[PDB]
Amino acid sequence: MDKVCAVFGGSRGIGRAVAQLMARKGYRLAVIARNLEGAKAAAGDLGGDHLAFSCDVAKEHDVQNTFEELEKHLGRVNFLVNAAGINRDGLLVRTKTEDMVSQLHTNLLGSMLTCKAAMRTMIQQQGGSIVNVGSIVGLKGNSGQSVYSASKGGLVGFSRALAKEVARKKIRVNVVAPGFVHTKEEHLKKNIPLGRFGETIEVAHAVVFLLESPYITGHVLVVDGGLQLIL
Amino acid sequence: HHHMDKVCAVFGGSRGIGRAVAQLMARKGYRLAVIARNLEGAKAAAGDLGGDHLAFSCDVAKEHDVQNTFEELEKHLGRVNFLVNAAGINRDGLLVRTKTEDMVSQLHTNLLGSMLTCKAAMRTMIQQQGGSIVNVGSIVGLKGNSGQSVYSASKGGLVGFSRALAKEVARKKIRVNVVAPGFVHTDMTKDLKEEHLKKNIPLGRFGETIEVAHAVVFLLESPYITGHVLVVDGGLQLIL
Amino acid sequence: QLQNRLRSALALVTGAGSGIGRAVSVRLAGEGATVAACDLDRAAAQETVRLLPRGNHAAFQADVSEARAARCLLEQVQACFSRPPSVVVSCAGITQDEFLLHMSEDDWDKVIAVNLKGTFLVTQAAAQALVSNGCRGSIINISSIVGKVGNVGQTNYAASKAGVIGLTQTAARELGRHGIRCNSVLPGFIATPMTQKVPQKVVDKITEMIPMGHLGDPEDVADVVAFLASEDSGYITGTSVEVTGGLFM
Amino acid sequence: QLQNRLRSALALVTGAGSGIGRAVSVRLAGEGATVAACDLDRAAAQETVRLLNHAAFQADVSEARAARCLLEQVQACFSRPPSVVVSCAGITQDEFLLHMSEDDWDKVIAVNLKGTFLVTQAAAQALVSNGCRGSIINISSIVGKVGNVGQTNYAASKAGVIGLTQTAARELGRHGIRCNSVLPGFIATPMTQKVPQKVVDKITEMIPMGHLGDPEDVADVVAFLASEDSGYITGTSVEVTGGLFM
Numbered sequence: 005m006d007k008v009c010a011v012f013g014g015s016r017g018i019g020r021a022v023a024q025l026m027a028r029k030g031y032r033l034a035v036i037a038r039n040l041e042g043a044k045a046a047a048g049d050l051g052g053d054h055l056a057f058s059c060d061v062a063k064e065h066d067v068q069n070t071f072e073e074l075e076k077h078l079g080r081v082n083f084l085v086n087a088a089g090i091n092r093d094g095l096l097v098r099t100k101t102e103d104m105v106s107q108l109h110t111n112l113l114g115s116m117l118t119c120k121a122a123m124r125t126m127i128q129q130q131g132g133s134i135v136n137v138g139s140i141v142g143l144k145g146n147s148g149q150s151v152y153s154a155s156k157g158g159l160v161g162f163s164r165a166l167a168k169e170v171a172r173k174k175i176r177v178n179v180v181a182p183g184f185v186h187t188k189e190e191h192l193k194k195n196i197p198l199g200r201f202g203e204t205i206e207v208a209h210a211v212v213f214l215l216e217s218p219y220i221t222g223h224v225l226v227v228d229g230g231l232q233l234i235l
Numbered sequence: 236h237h238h239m240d241k242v243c244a245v246f247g248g249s250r251g252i253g254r255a256v257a258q259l260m261a262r263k264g265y266r267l268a269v270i271a272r273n274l275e276g277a278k279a280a281a282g283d284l285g286g287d288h289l290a291f292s293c294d295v296a297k298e299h300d301v302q303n304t305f306e307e308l309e310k311h312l313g314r315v316n317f318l319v320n321a322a323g324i325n326r327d328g329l330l331v332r333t334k335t336e337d338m339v340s341q342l343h344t345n346l347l348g349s350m351l352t353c354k355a356a357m358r359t360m361i362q363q364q365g366g367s368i369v370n371v372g373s374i375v376g377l378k379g380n381s382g383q384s385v386y387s388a389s390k391g392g393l394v395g396f397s398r399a400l401a402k403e404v405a406r407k408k409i410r411v412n413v414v415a416p417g418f419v420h421t422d423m424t425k426d427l428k429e430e431h432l433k434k435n436i437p438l439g440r441f442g443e444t445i446e447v448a449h450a451v452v453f454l455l456e457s458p459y460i461t462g463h464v465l466v467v468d469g470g471l472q473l474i475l
Numbered sequence: 476q477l478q479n480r481l482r483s484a485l486a487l488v489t490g491a492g493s494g495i496g497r498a499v500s501v502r503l504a505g506e507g508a509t510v511a512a513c514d515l516d517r518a519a520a521q522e523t524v525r526l527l528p529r530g531n532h533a534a535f536q537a538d539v540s541e542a543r544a545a546r547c548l549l550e551q552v553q554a555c556f557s558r559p560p561s562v563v564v565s566c567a568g569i570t571q572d573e574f575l576l577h578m579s580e581d582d583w584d585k586v587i588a589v590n591l592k593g594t595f596l597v598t599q600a601a602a603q604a605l606v607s608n609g610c611r612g613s614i615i616n617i618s619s620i621v622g623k624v625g626n627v628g629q630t631n632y633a634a635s636k637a638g639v640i641g642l643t644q645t646a647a648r649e650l651g652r653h654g655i656r657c658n659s660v661l662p663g664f665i666a667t668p669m670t671q672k673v674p675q676k677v678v679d680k681i682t683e684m685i686p687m688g689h690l691g692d693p694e695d696v697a698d699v700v701a702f703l704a705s706e707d708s709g710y711i712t713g714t715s716v717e718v719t720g721g722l723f724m
Numbered sequence: 725q726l727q728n729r730l731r732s733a734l735a736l737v738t739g740a741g742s743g744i745g746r747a748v749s750v751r752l753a754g755e756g757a758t759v760a761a762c763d764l765d766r767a768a769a770q771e772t773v774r775l776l777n778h779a780a781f782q783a784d785v786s787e788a789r790a791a792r793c794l795l796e797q798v799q800a801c802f803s804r805p806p807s808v809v810v811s812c813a814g815i816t817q818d819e820f821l822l823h824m825s826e827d828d829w830d831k832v833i834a835v836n837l838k839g840t841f842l843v844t845q846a847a848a849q850a851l852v853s854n855g856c857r858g859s860i861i862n863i864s865s866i867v868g869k870v871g872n873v874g875q876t877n878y879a880a881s882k883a884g885v886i887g888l889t890q891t892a893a894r895e896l897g898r899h900g901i902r903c904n905s906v907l908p909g910f911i912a913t914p915m916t917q918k919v920p921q922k923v924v925d926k927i928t929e930m931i932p933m934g935h936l937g938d939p940e941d942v943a944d945v946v947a948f949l950a951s952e953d954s955g956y957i958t959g960t961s962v963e964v965t966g967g968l969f970m
């Protein structure tokens with residue numbers, strides 16, 4: 005029941021900020037991505053004892069063998085962070101099926117595969133915490149981001165469905181729904197109540213919070229700065 | 236009478252909600268296209284509707300089947316300015332006991348299939364400076380349910396997609412909405428404990444296909460409603 | 476087009492003397508429902524009735540914020556038509572806009588009393604009138620899109636409208652096994668006298684924010700209300716229906 | 725460690741005399757925040773302070789005069805406005821809609837909704853006047869989202885709290901004042917001991933975690949919202965229900 009967390013997509017952006025923050029808190033992190041060179045660089049500045057792995061979460065067995073490497077080198081994974089995702093803006097009319105299937109398997113199906121592989125370990129230990137990084141556009145939608153919205157709206161119902169299913173096994177699943185994160189904004193940042201774009205470390209603090217809160221599951225924590233009130 | 240310039244494409248209109256949506260819109264004056272994988276079943280559906288209404292065979296998972304269907308759709312009935320996505324499958328099962336193939340199956344049928352459908356409808360709805368789309372989701376899609384993990388995921392993205400599309404094409408006089416029915420008497424809710432469940436439900440019963448159908452028609456005919464999720468569960472969402 | 480959908484239905488509409496409430500009364504009467512138009516201004520209520528098989532429509536005067544007026548209203552309708560209203564709509568609402576730092580206690584209490592307490596009293600009295608007669612019914616409470624997201628200068632208005640939602644959800648849960656449906660309408664900005672109190676350029680900015688790119692007409696709200704009133708939505712209760720044009724979806 | 729997370733904060737907590745408000749005071753003080761424990765009960769607030777420089781206050785949040793008086797008592801004792809404001813003051817007068825009296829409606833609304841408005845308003849005014857940023861935390865309920873039988877007045881108030889806080893967050897964003905709502909499920913408190921045991925058993929079966937929450941669980945989210953770690957979170961409803969009515 006130690007402090008070991010698996011952060012998929014922890015080489016860049018939010019997932020990288022999540023790994024950075026949990027390393028300062030004393031967690032044993034694993035930085036997972038496709039580009040292993042990026043994962044190593046991320047887990048390199050994360051202090052020491054942190055490992056890096058290569059995995060395409062859109063693949064059924066790629067994530068399988070990645071978890072058996074996790075279990076083998078880090079041990080039981082107590083915390084799962086699904087921050088792996090892709091985004092290519094474009095109109096639905098100007099979006100070929102290949103890109104539509106691509107984002108779906110990465111942003112949605114990918115998180116379903118990872119959460120599934122983390123089950124039998126967390127189930128046998130009767131303890132585990134999962135946070136799936138989504139978006140505000142996954143719920144409220146945004147123009148030119150239909151495919152991304154579907155993929156990010158899907159794992160909201162998924163995380164909740166998994167929550168009611170595994171809550172009796174002392175396992176919690178939550179969703180962080182960030183808004184505009186800094187990583188164009190002039191006629192947009194003025195709208196937001198806080199008057200600025202967010203930071204990856206600010207989103208990361210929300211992620212860690214959901215993982216450490218004992219009575220929170222199936223909840224969608226929004227980190228937007230009041231954007232959802234005007235979006 | 237006059238020109239039937241109100242054409243509706245009901246995907247999954249062979250049975251259940253889609254068939255009911257079909258039957259109801261057929262009497263309201265709309266010209267219909269009963270669409271499903273099983274051509275024999277879709278043909279029988281369009282039979283009791285009328286001679287003006289045609290049946291087509293299509294699997295929404297395949298992009299080309301959708302493309303070829305909309306091609307034959309226009310070259311026989313005219314431009315499609317109304318859309319109903321009632322094509323979807325369900326498989327109850329624990330996530331740990333769920334095959335990846337079964338995941339991709341529901342995701343492509345219920346979610347990706349409804350995206351390809353809306354995509355092809357854009358062409359005909361822009362060419363008529365007006366359209367209305369109803370995507371049939373579920374009250375489980377946003378709330379989730381133990382055993383309906385993959386289904387919740389597929390139905391979940393349907394809301395974010397329809398809303399993102401609603402904003403994207405609202406200026407082209409095209410409305411996109413979602414119907415969120417609860418427990419409805421179809422082939423999908425065949426082996427469900429209607430006894431132990433309905434004791435909680437405020438209306439104390441399950442919904443019929445025509446009750447969801449009326450909601451679909453309502454959203455299609457509500458000129459100032461887009462990107463909305465209409466809930467037809469008899470008050471189930473207050474307990475779920 | 477679709478009259479006689481509410482042929483055998485008595486409809487009570489509070490705040491029917493103007494805007495949405497007026498359009499609702501016209502739409503309901505347009506589908507066959509005898510409308511009991513209620514409004515604080517009786518002259519406005521009578522004007523609505525003038526713009527409309529059994530008997531005729533009736534105008535009622537009542538301050539929905541007062542518990543006694545809420546009871547006497549229902550009793551007077553039952554006295555006039557010898558039956559409780561099968562359809563009840565609460566359009567009685569006011570605005571007293573002010574920033575949070577400057578909002579007085581009166582600007583708060585008044586909006587709450589009319590929009591929140593007023594709706595509660597109308598809902599309660601109408602429900603009691605339906606239970607004591609074994610009559611099914613549909614209660615429709617006009618909330619707002621503000622009641623879901625809040626709005627600048629409307630601390631009192633948003634709190635009231637949000638309260639209506641939590642109120643209707645509770646009413647639907649209790650009146651469910653009594654054959655009474657309860658739903659809330661969440662309109663965006665509508666071309667009503669209430670929005671004529673909004674500065675023209677603010678309306679301009681709002682218009683360019685609404686995805687459809689225009690203010691909805693009161694008839695759009697009436698369409699939703701007419702649907703919730705009919706048995707076409709017989710399996711719809713405890714539901715919030717948004718008619719915003721995509722605003723704040 | 726988080727025991728210095730709120731070392732520089734002055735926290736005002738209404739309803740700090742019992743249940744959640746007391747647990748909130750414990751957590752905040754446990755993180756270095758000097759707590760201004762307020763409550764309708766004079767002794768309960770003082771005993772809360774005793775369990776925790778700290779100070780106790782008495783006020784009726786439902787009354788406008790007592791609200792502005794409370795904030796003035798704080799700014800006088802600590803020579804500063806409270807950077808953290810938590811509204812846990814709430815009551816319950818359950819009765820069916822058909823049988824709910826006017827008084828049972830008026831009192832719950834005044835305390836839970838209006839009482840929260842006055843505190844939030846007076847808090848913001850004290851922060852804007854001194855040019856000090858802050859975080860306002862209003863304790864709503866999961867009932868505010870879906871409603872609950874016998875709690876028409878309670879659900880209306882709690883739902884009103886959310887829209888209230890959402891409005892505040894959008895208006896006070898320019899002054900660096902974050903406003904958020906906490907939506908807790910059923911928690912082992914004296915308030916929960918009011919409802920009958922037979923119903924408590926059913927609820928526990930409905931809760932996905934299969935048990936009532938602890939007041940410390942609610943304070944855990946309040947401490948986070950009060951911190952700089954949520955410096956980009958405003959107008960957000962946080963749910964602590966154990967999955968109940970997600």
Ligand SMILES: NC(=O)c1ccc[n+]([C@@H]2O[C@H](COP(=O)([O-])OP(=O)(O)OC[C@H]3O[C@@H](n4cnc5c(N)ncnc54)[C@H](OP(=O)(O)O)[C@@H]3O)[C@@H](O)[C@H]2O)c1
Binds near residue numbers: 252271296374
């Ligand atoms: N029934 C409920 O309680 C309930 C609850 C929530 C949501 N819904 C939604 O309501 C909709 C219809 O209700 P139902 O499914 O319960 O009735 P149903 O009897 O299951 O009808 C489903 C229809 O979808 C078609 N379909 C299935 N897979 C398809 C594919 N890959 N491509 C094209 N068409 C396909 C079927 O036609 P074929 O004969 O070709 O398969 C059939 O006509 C579903 O989409 C479901 O998501 C229903």
